[PDB]
Design a protein around this ligand. Structure first.
Ligand SMILES: [Mg+2]
Ligand SMILES: [Mg+2]
Ligand SMILES: [Zn+2]
Lengths: 196, 134, 190, 52
RNA sequence: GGACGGUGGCCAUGGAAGUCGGAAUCCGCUAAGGAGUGUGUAACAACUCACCUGCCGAAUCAACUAGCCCUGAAAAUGGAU
């Protein structure tokens, strides 16, 4: 089973790289299976995306390189959680749509947040039975029209710090836009060419 | 959102139930339907199907309309009271039909063995209606 | 089975030097000097070069139990290097439900008094090991900082503090009060 | 009252542990065999029961 | 890190939504995912596993088997290779 799986995978990779001459190597950050399905549906119309084992990738593009030259210069660059998107379209048309269809990922517990966000002073809009998280975090909230109101601006998160469980559940219930990330292009490959 | 929304699903069907059903337990979430709401929801939800009938409702602030997603087992148990290939071929036309698909045959392959509750020889060697739907 | 040779090499940074007197290792760095003998283990210690200061630990014809000691010696020497270069700092937090735990640091950080652990009138006097200094952190409200050069001495002092505040005759899964080692790190962060 | 991170720190030493079924020894949470001779280093271990 | 869509799969129902139970084990995305090995939530939810992937760059894992040793192994006057 495993050997047949790997052999079929090798055949798929070699036929795909022979069929499609233009491919962008793209890094995968902390992305979900729902995002994978969404990207698959949104991209399967015009191009294809490939995201598997890096050892498989290097072995396929190295051992069977004899069919076409000008390929070994990808080898010292394919590292990390990366894959290949194969397209017959052009760089701008792929890049703008792939940079636009970024799902707003939430604040998962245990995830680093290089970006910075800050909650403003606005009504929560939820019932006044969730003051426990605010009081545990140290947030001054008072009753107003049967809703919870943030009377003062407070520092929520800084850059490059761990997110606690209380902060994560607060950002989950707040229904706001937290720091988000997705599938980001590392570099390109158009018939033997490396750019941004 | 009109100060209240009815996104929540239900898992009741067949018998009317009403008081025996958990609809009064959902009730305090919105306070709008109550008994005069769940009775009139069940009035249109008596059939399609006659089973548990997981379905969504939409509120017009006075009355509720009900839409039943085309669940495979739900619709096949509604159909049931043999191959019957054509009814399962046509039952998937009006569904969401996403199923992480890549071809039309995936949906019928899914439902052929969703009917296994043998409908597996077709799954093994099927050679009909691959591009029938598109 | 007797393995012919089991060796392991520890690199020594440039700012710290190591002198061998038989199986006694003397590690002198910017923060002090740590001296420790390994005469209870029959290994061979050698300093290799005048350039990068490798220290090799060799065991000849050792069975499994005494092959286990080579990496133990190497890790001890690495801890000595770490202590004399960056030092060891253990941060402890005092957690309590009702009675705050009052900690008073007596002369030069060598004595720790715990006053109101679980509201009892007993006073816990815990004496730190020599070379270990305790202090009350200025960044956190309930935090002790134990700093020293010897990791075993610092951690033993932290264990003494932790074991002094032990809840007895109660459900310890409910009475979580006490002083616990929150983190272990270095001084100077270099 | 104890805030959750300090509660987790206390529970790391007080609750998150293994218990030998034969000799009731308190073992580290990743233990597979008991460390004590009187039970014969048995591998009959259970989690320490929670207050929940 | 992902551990999905149909599907909060069917018959059990007062919630059992993958895990109080009875049957069967589908398909596709593929890097994988059990229409579920466990924790648990009234129930949702939130976790974990088997399954794959990333970093890591050389060997590793499992089930048995039998030698010595240990546990099993408690008695009365102080004592017997
Ligand atoms: Mg008691
Ligand atoms: Mg014996
Ligand atoms: Zn034991």
């Amino acid at each position: 089973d495993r050997a047949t799986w790997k052999s079929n995978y090798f055949l798929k990779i070699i036929q795909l790289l022979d069929d499609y001459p233009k491919c962008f190597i793209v890094g995968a950050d902390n992305v979900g299976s729902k995002q994978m399905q969404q990207i698959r549906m949104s991209l399967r119309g015009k191009a294809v995306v490939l995201m598997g084992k890096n050892t498989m990738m290097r072995k396929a593009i190295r051992g069977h390189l004899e069919n076409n030259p000008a390929l070994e210069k990808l080898l010292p660059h394919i590292r990390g959680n990366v894959g290949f998107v194969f397209t017959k379209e052009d760089l701008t048309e792929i890049r703008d749509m792939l940079l636009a269809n970024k799902v707003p990922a939430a604040a998962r517990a245990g995830a680093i947040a290089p970006c910075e966000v800050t909650v403003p002073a606005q009504n929560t809009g939820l019932g006044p039975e969730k003051t426990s998280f605010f009081q545990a975090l140290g947030i001054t909230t008072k009753i107003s029209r049967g809703t919870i109101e943030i009377l003062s601006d407070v520092q929520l998160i800084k850059t490059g710090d761990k997110v606690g469980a209380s902060e994560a559940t607060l950002l989950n219930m707040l229904n706001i836009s937290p720091f988000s990330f997705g599938l980001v292009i590392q570099q390109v490959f158009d018939n033997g060419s490396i750019y941004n | 959102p009109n100060e209240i929304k009815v996104v929540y699903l239900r898992c009741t069907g067949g018998e009317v139930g009403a008081t025996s059903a958990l609809a009064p337990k959902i009730g305090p979430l919105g306070l709008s339907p109550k008994k005069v709401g769940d009775d009139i929801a069940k009035a249109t939800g008596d059939w399609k199907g006659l089973r548990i009938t997981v379905k969504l409702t939409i509120q017009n602030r006075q009355a509720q309309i009900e839409v039943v997603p085309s669940a495979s087992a739900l619709i096949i148990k509604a159909l049931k009271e043999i191959t019957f290939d054509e009814i399962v071929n046509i039952a998937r036309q009006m569904r969401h039909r996403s199923l992480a698909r890549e071809l039309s045959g995936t949906i019928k392959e899914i439902l052929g063995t969703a009917q296994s509750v043998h409908p597996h020889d077709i799954i093994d060697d099927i050679n009909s209606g691959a591009v029938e739907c598109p | 089975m007797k393995t012919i040779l089991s060796n392991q090499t520890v690199d020594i940074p440039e700012n710290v030097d190591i002198t061998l007197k038989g199986r006694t290792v003397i590690v002198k760095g910017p923060r002090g000097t740590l001296r420790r003998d390994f005469n209870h283990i029959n290994v061979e210690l050698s300093l290799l070069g005048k350039k990068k200061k490798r220290l090799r630990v060799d065991k000849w014809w050792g069975n499994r139990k005494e092959l286990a000691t080579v990496r133990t010696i190497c890790s001890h020497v690495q801890n000595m290097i770490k202590g004399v270069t960056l030092g060891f700092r253990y941060k402890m937090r005092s957690v309590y439900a009702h009675f705050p735990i009052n900690v008073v640091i007596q002369e030069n950080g060598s004595l720790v008094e715990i006053r109101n652990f679980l509201g009892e009138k007993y006073i816990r006097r815990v004496r730190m090991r020599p070379g270990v200094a305790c202090s009350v952190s200025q960044a956190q409200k309930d935090e002790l900082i134990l700093e020293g050069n010897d990791i075993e001495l610092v951690s033993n002092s932290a264990a003494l503090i932790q074991q002094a505040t032990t809840v007895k005759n109660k459900d310890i899964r409910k009475f979580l009060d006490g002083i616990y080692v929150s983190e272990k790190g270095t001084v100077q962060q270099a | 009252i104890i805030e959750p991170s300090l509660r987790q720190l206390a529970q790391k030493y007080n609750c998150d542990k293994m218990i030998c079924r034969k000799c009731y020894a308190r073992l580290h949470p990743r233990a597979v065999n008991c460390r004590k001779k009187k039970c014969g280093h048995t591998n009959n271990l259970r989690p320490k029961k929670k207050v929940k």
